[PDB]
Amino acid sequence: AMVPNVVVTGLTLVCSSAPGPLELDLTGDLESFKKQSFVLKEGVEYRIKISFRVNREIVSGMKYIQHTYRKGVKIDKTDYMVGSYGPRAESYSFLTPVEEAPKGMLARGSYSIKSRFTDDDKTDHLSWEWNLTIKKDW
Secondary structure (H helix, E strand, O other): OOOOOEEEEEEEEEOOOOOOOOEEEOOOOHHHHHHOOEEEEOOOEEEEEEEEEEOOOOEEEEEEEEEEEEOOEEEEEEEEEEEEEOOOOOOEEEEOOOEEOOOOHHHOEEEEEEEEEEOOOOOOOEEEEEEEEEEOOO
16 A cells, blocks of 8 residues: 555446446445446347556466356356566556356346456455346346
C-alpha cells in the first residue's frame, strides 16, 4: 500500500451481442456483486477480461481461477495462466478463451462464480464472487 504492487481493478464480460455493459469495478465494494447478476442470452459467445495493474516490481506466474457453482453446488473449476508481468503505467488485460453461455432450457438459470487472482507466491491479489443469469433472451 497505500499503492500496492498489484491492483486488480476490473472484470468485463466481452460479449459483442450484449445490449449493455457487463463490468465489475473491482476497486469498490466486492460484497455488492453477490445480490447482482450479469444476464447472458443462452448460447452467446463471450470472453472474461481481467484488468490489473503492476506498479513497482516484477510478479511471476500470475494466475486467474474461476470456480462455478449452481445453487451453491460446485460444478466446475478452471485455471488460467496469466504470466509474468513487470510494472507499467498502463493497466494490463487478460482475456480468457472465447466460450459459449450454456444453452437449452435445462441449462438456463443462475450460476455463481468465485474468482481469484494469484501468483506463484500464492498471494491473494483479489478474491471476489459474482453471478451469471442465463436466459432465453436479453
